[PDB]
From Swiss-Prot:
The keyword Nucleus applies. GO terms for cellular component: nucleus. Transmembrane segments: none annotated. Keywords: Nucleus. It is found in: Nucleus. Its main location: nucleus. Present with 5350 molecules/cell in log phase SD medium. The keyword tRNA processing does not apply. This is Translation machinery-associated protein 16. It comes from Saccharomyces cerevisiae (strain ATCC 204508 / S288c). Belongs to the TMA16 family. The chain holds residues 38 to 178 of 178 of the full protein.
Length: 141
């Protein structure tokens, strides 16, 4: 009903979304933890493995909606909407998802040293990867 005398002051720099950062954070954390600490470098098969898990994580969340369906209260709109975002995310992946090559040890070490740095997201060996680790190029040959 009421607003304060102060208006919502704004930021000058545009923020990057977690769709980019959390993706690297996952890869980083996996390497930095005993999860795959024994594995120094990965490949493009592990690319799809981790990339798809990052996207399809929505289904793990959607599963809770599928769960509360038995509570006799399913989210008619939001359960569909959640799945619709998956279609969009998969479509971006299908158009070459912004993924590290994951096989370059220089890139992987920078990936390890990601201190939540935005500029580091430009120094990383990030390319566009489709499906099974396919190289997405605009057309240079």
């Amino acid at each position: 009903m009421r607003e304060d005398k102060i208006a919502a002051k704004k930021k000058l720099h545009q923020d990057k979304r977690v769709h980019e950062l959390a993706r690297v954070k996952f890869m980083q954390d996996v390497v930095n933890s005993d999860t795959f600490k024994g594995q120094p470098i990965f490949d493009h098969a592990h690319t799809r493995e981790f990339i798809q898990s990052f996207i399809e994580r929505d289904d793990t969340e959607l599963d809770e909606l599928k769960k509360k369906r038995r509570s006799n209260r399913p989210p008619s709109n939001r359960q569909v909407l959640l799945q619709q975002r998956r279609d969009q995310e998969l479509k971006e992946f299908k158009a070459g998802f912004l993924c590290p090559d994951l096989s370059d040890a220089k890139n992987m070490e920078f990936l390890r040293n990601w201190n939540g740095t935005f500029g580091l997201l430009n120094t990383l060996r990030l390319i566009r990867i489709n499906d099974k680790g396919e190289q997405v190029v605009g057309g240079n040959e």
